[PDB]
Write a protein that binds this ligand. Structure first.
Ligand code: CL
Ligand code: CL
Ligand code: K
Ligand code: K
Length: 367
RNA sequence: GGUCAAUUUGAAACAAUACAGAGAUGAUCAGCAGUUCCCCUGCAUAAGGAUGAACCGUUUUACAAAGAGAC
């Protein structure tokens, strides 16, 4: 659990003159110690400015705090540790942006100093944010107003940040190594009570899940998932791998997680030579590793005016600082190509191209 | 047609979308090992050091069917 604690390195400066931007907060405080990052924000009535400064070390911060109550051309500033001012927020809509979060707070009259979103490099689905406000009391006010708020059909979660209090995820059985997947069952074997009787001896079973539609399209091979109450039981159930059940040699293994599956689907595309498949897709690059496929979807629909039905899938390729958009057909993909190349996304200009173009652009970013 | 196979198919990824920062990761983008070059200490083609970058190996791998290509 021990990693870092920003309240030892990060200070809050209150009452800076309206002229003070990032650049010149930097210049004022950089003698205090080396600085990693500065953010600046207007007060509610635009009468003064707040700054948030992350120092490289706690002693840079303590040095900054020695300037509390000093005068910066006209104004008596206050410099303190930024402590108890961090919120954590999740279950906002998939396409919600840093700006949207900032307007959310602004509509309740709360200044936001910093809003930090996670890298999607290793998991495309991550969706949460940390948000620093200017007082403990604002933080409490945000929870009271925003926790439980319905936004575009999503019930928001907003809390005072405390990672030690985090909750169990609804899919944590799989992360703990407690869920097995059973493969190559026949339709005759794809029956809950049948699997239950055959696996109960390994340990107590918590859940059995059978993906729908396997009998109904009568598959040759069917699959199922089973969650045990503890790890050891599931590990014992792996002895059933390569064993006889009815007329089948079945397979049994610990279920994989979505990020692992999704990454391998991307790799398959990145190695395809099936030009049929490749004619249907285009890449956008370069993109921040914070940008999700939902945000890209929303861009495509709201700003480029594409219909949702024309878009089959959107996948991240953060190792080349891009994304892949698979369209309904190649003719549509070819028009979109010209339209998207040079378009604006998140206030910067993006490009579109084939996979190879995305690589060339990335390799050349390396040089 | 014997030995290596990029890959394809059987074939279905459930379980609540979110659910704790680059504070994240499973070779998921890894570990280990090697080669060349880049960067700082030096008269330097002597010896150290930290980064990189381009490469080369090796470790790993449910089952069945089919298979560009490669001895
Ligand atoms: Cl810190
Ligand atoms: Cl925290
Ligand atoms: K903290
Ligand atoms: K390797």
């Amino acid at each position: 659990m021990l990693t870092r604690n920003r309240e030892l390195t990060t200070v809050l400066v209150k009452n800076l003159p309206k002229s003070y931007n990032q650049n010149k907060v930097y210049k004022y405080f950089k003698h205090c110690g080396p600085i990693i990052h500065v953010d600046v924000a207007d007060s509610l009535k635009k009468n003064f400015r707040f700054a948030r400064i992350e120092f490289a070390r706690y002693d840079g911060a303590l040095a900054a705090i020695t300037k509390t109550h000093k005068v910066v051309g006209q104004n008596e500033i206050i410099v303190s540790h930024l402590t108890e001012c961090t919120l954590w927020m999740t279950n906002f809509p998939p396409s919600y942006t840093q700006r949207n979060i900032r307007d959310l707070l602004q509509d309740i009259n709360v200044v936001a100093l910093s809003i930090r979103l996670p890298s999607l490099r290793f998991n495309t689905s991550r969706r949460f944010a940390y948000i620093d406000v200017t007082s403990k009391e604002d933080a409490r006010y945000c929870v009271e107003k925003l926790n439980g708020l319905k936004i575009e059909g999503y019930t928001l979660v907003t809390k005072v940040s405390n990672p030690l209090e985090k909750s169990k995820r609804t899919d944590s059985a799989t992360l703990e190594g407690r869920e097995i997947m059973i493969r190559n069952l026949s339709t005759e074997l794809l029956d809950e009570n049948l699997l239950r009787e055959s696996f109960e001896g390994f340990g107590s079973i918590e859940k059995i899940n059978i993906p729908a539609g396997q009998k109904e399209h009568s598959f040759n091979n069917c699959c199922a998932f089973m969650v045990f109450e503890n790890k050891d039981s599931a590990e014992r159930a792996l002895q059933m791998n390569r064993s006889l059940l009815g007329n089948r040699e079945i397979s049994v293994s610990l279920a994989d997680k979505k990020p692992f599956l999704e990454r391998n689907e991307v790799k398959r595309l990145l190695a395809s030579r099936n030009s049929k498949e490749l004619e249907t897709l285009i890449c956008l690059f370069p993109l921040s590793d914070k940008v999700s496929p939902s945000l890209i979807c929303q861009f495509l629909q709201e700003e480029i005016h594409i219909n949702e039905k024309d878009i089959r899938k959107i996948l991240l390729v953060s190792d080349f600082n891009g994304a892949i958009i698979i369209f309904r057909d190649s003719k549509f993909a070819a028009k979109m190509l010209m339209i998207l190349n040079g378009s604006q996304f998140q206030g910067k200009v993006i490009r579109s191209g084939t996979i190879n173009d995305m690589k060339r652009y990335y390799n050349n970013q390396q040089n």
